[PDB]
Amino acid sequence: FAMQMAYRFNGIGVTQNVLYENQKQIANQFNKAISQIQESLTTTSTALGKLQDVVNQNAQALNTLVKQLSSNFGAISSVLNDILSRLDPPEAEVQIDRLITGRLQSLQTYVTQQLIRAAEIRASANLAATKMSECVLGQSKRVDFCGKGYHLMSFPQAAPHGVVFLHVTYVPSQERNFTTAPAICHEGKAYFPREGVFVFNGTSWFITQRNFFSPQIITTDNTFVSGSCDVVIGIINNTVYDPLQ
Amino acid sequence: KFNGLTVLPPLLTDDMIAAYTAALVSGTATAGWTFGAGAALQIPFAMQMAYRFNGIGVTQNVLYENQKQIANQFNKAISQIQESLTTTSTALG
Amino acid sequence: LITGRLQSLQTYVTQQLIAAEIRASANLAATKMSECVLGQSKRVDFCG
Amino acid sequence: LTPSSKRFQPFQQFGRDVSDFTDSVRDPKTSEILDISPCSFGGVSVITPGTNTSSEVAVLYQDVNCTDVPVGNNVFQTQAGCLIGAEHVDTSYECDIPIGAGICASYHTVSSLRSTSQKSIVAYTMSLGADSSIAYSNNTIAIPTNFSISITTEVMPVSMAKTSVDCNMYICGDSTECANLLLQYGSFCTQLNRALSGIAVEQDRNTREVFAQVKQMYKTPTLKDFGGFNFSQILPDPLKPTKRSFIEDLLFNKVTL
Amino acid sequence: LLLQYGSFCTQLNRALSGIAVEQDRNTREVFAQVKQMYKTPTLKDFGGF
C-alpha cells in the first residue's frame, strides 16, 4: 500500500521522500478523516438529498396519477359503473367517452414526464460511470472532476438507487512568502531550473517543488544551461554547486 | 403580465456575475492555477507562463528568452478579438 | 375551451422542459470553468 | 387607465397592441386617448424559518408597487416585490433562503433590537464571498509548507424506480363496455406500455453499467489494516451478517422512505 | 369545470417552478467556483503582459 501511495504522490508533484518520511502522521490523518465522514453521515444530516429527492417525485408522480383516477373529467360519475347503471347506452357512451379521453390524457401526462425523468437519470448515471472509471480506477490529473484540489484516490459506496463517492484529496496549506527569480546567472551563463522553482530564504538561494517547501543545493543536474545571461529578464547572480568538482 | 404570464428576475443579477468574473480573472492573474486547488498562493506572471510551457512541452528557457514577442502577440490577439467583437458578428447568435 | 387551452399549456410545458439541453450545456460550462479556467488541460481540443 | 402620449391617427380611434390588446382607447366625449393596461395579479409566497426555530413568517408578492397592495413594519420594496414583517439591513451575509434580484432572507438574531434578540427575519444583499487580499510582486512567490487530507462526500443518482402499468385497468377498470370504445382509440396504450418497458430495461442496463465495471469478484482481505492505514469502515466486516460496509449500513437508514 | 378537472394546474406550476430553480442552480454552479472574492489589482499590466 505504501508503494501505491508514494507513486500516487509522484502523480501529484510531490516526491516519494515526503510519504516515506511522513507515513505515520499522514495515515493518522487519513484515519481521522474516515472517522469524520463516519460521524458526519452518522448524524441526521441529510446531505444525500440528491439520492432522496428522486424517489419523492416518483411517489408524488404516482400519487397524482392515482388521485387523477378519482377525479372525473367532464363526467358526472367518477366511477364508471355508475355511468353504466344510470343512463341509456347512447348518452352513457358520451359520458364514458369523456372519461376515457380524460383518463388517457392523464396517462400521457404521466408517460411524457416519466420519459423526461428517464433522460435526466440517464445523464446523471452516465456521469456516474465516468466518475467510477476515471476516479476509483486511476489517479486523475483532471482537476475538480473527482475532488477539490489534487486527487489522490477514490472509494465507492453503494446506496439505495445511487452511488456515494468518497474522495481522498490533497490540499496544501501554511503559506510562506519567498524571494524568487526566474533564473540564475552562474558564470556569465544562464541556467534554468528543471521541475522546480528557485527560492531565497534570506541567506542563499535554493531549489524546491511547488507543494512542499524543501530546499536543495542548486546542481548541474538540477538545471540546464540555455542562452546567455543578458537575455533573461530579472536573472540574478549566484553559484551552482557541482558535486564532482 | 399578460393574462397570467410572469417572468422572474434571476437570483444573481448581472452585476454580481461581473464581479465573479473579475475575481476569476484577477486570481488567474495573480495566484495562478493553484488557487483552484484549495487556497491561493501568489506567483509572478512570467513564472506562471514559463511553468505552463513546461507543462505543454517546451522548457521555460524559450519563454524567458522570447518574453517580449509573446507579450506583444498576446496583446495583439486581445486587440484583434476586441475588434472582432466590436464588429457586428454571429458569435453571439 | 378548457380542453384546448389545457392541452395547449401542456404542450408549452413539455417544450419548455425540452430545458434539459440548457442544463447539459451548463454542466459542460461548469467543467470548462473548473478544468481549463482553473488550470492547464492536457486533454486536447476541449479548450480552444 | 393612464393618460396616453403616443398619438393616434385622427380618424382612427381604438388601438390594439402587438398582441392586439387595447393599448389605448380614444375617449368619445373628448377625442383623447387613454393608455390601458391590466393591473397587478400577484402570486402569494411565504418565507418561513423552521417551525422548530419560530412561527413568525414573511410574505412576498411579485406584482407589487407597495402602494398597490392592500394592508408591515418597513415594507422593503425589491424588484421581487415588497415583503412584510422584515427589515432591510445594510450588513451582508452568505445568502440564505433567497428572495432573488439580489435579496436573501434569514431567520437571524436581530442584533439590531439591542439584547432582546427577537431573531427577526431580515432581508439583505448577499456577500459574494469573503474578501481576499493579494499583491502582485514580480519577484515574490508563495509556497505552502503543510499538507492536509480532507475527504468529501459526493452523491450521484443512478437508477429509477422500475414501474409498470396496464392501460385497460387504469383507463377503464373492468367494464366490458370499455375496450370497444377504447379499441376505437387504436394502439395508444400499446406504445404507452412499450415505452415504459423500454425505460425499465434501460435503467437495468444503466445499473449494470455503473457498478459492474469490475473484472472479477476479488476476495475481500482478512486483515482490515494496510501498512498502518485503516479501512475498517468501507470494507464489509466478515463478522457482520450484512456483508456490507458500516458506512453503507448507516446509509441505508439515513435515507428516509 | 377546471375544478372538475384534476390538479393539472398543480403539475404545470410545479414543473415550471422546478425549471426556474434549476436555472438559478446552474448559474450558481457555473459562476460560483471561487471561495474568496479577489480585489482587482490596481495595475492592469504584468511583466509586459
Ligand SMILES: *[C@@H]1O[C@H](CO)[C@@H](O[C@@H]2O[C@H](CO)[C@@H](O)[C@H](O)[C@H]2NC(C)=O)[C@H](O)[C@H]1NC(C)=O
Ligand atoms: C537558509 O539557508 C541556509 C543555508 O543552507 C541555512 O543555513 C544552514 O542551516 C542548516 C540547518 O541546520 C545547517 O545544518 C547549516 O549548517 C546552515 N548553514 C549555514 C552556512 O549556516 C538556514 O538554516 C536557512 N534558513 C531558513 C530560515 O530557511
Ligand SMILES: *[C@@H]1O[C@H](CO)[C@@H](O[C@@H]2O[C@H](CO)[C@@H](O)[C@H](O)[C@H]2NC(C)=O)[C@H](O)[C@H]1NC(C)=O
Ligand atoms: C553579476 O556579476 C557580473 C560580474 O561581476 C556583473 O557584470 C559586471 O559587473 C560589474 C560589477 O563590478 C559591473 O560594473 C558591470 O557593469 C557588469 N557588466 C559588464 C562588465 O558587462 C553583473 O552585473 C552581475 N549581475 C547581477 C545581477 O548582480
Ligand SMILES: *[C@@H]1O[C@H](CO)[C@@H](O[C@@H]2O[C@H](CO)[C@@H](O)[C@H](O)[C@H]2NC(C)=O)[C@H](O)[C@H]1NC(C)=O
Ligand atoms: C502540519 O501542521 C501540523 C499541526 O501542528 C503538524 O502536526 C504536528 O506537528 C508537530 C511538529 O511538526 C508534531 O510534534 C505533532 O506530533 C504533529 N501532530 C499531528 C496530529 O500531526 C504537522 O506535522 C505539520 N506537517 C508537517 C509535514 O510537519
Ligand SMILES: *[C@@H]1O[C@H](CO)[C@@H](O[C@@H]2O[C@H](CO)[C@@H](O)[C@H](O)[C@H]2NC(C)=O)[C@H](O)[C@H]1NC(C)=O
Ligand atoms: C480501524 O478502525 C476501526 C474503526 O475506527 C477500529 O475499530 C474500532 O476500535 C475501537 C477500539 O477498540 C472500538 O472502540 C470501536 O468500537 C471499533 N469500531 C469498529 C467499527 O470496529 C479498528 O480497531 C481499527 N483497526 C486498526 C488496525 O487501526
Ligand SMILES: *[C@@H]1O[C@H](CO)[C@@H](O)[C@H](O)[C@H]1NC(C)=O
Ligand atoms: C508575506 O505574506 C503576507 C500574506 O500572508 C503579506 O501580508 C506580507 O506583506 C508578505 N510579506 C512579504 C515581505 O512579502
Ligand SMILES: *[C@@H]1O[C@H](CO)[C@@H](O)[C@H](O)[C@H]1NC(C)=O
Ligand atoms: C520588479 O518590481 C520592482 C518594483 O515594482 C522594480 O523596481 C523592478 O525593476 C522589477 N523587476 C522586474 C524584473 O520586473
Ligand SMILES: *[C@@H]1O[C@H](CO)[C@@H](O)[C@H](O)[C@H]1NC(C)=O
Ligand atoms: C362633449 O359634450 C359636451 C356636452 O355638450 C361638451 O360640453 C364637450 O365640449 C364635448 N367634448 C368634445 C366635443 O370634445
Ligand SMILES: *[C@@H]1O[C@H](CO)[C@@H](O)[C@H](O)[C@H]1NC(C)=O
Ligand atoms: C410606485 O408608485 C410611486 C408613486 O406613484 C411611483 O413614484 C413609483 O415610480 C412606482 N413604482 C413602480 C411603478 O414600480
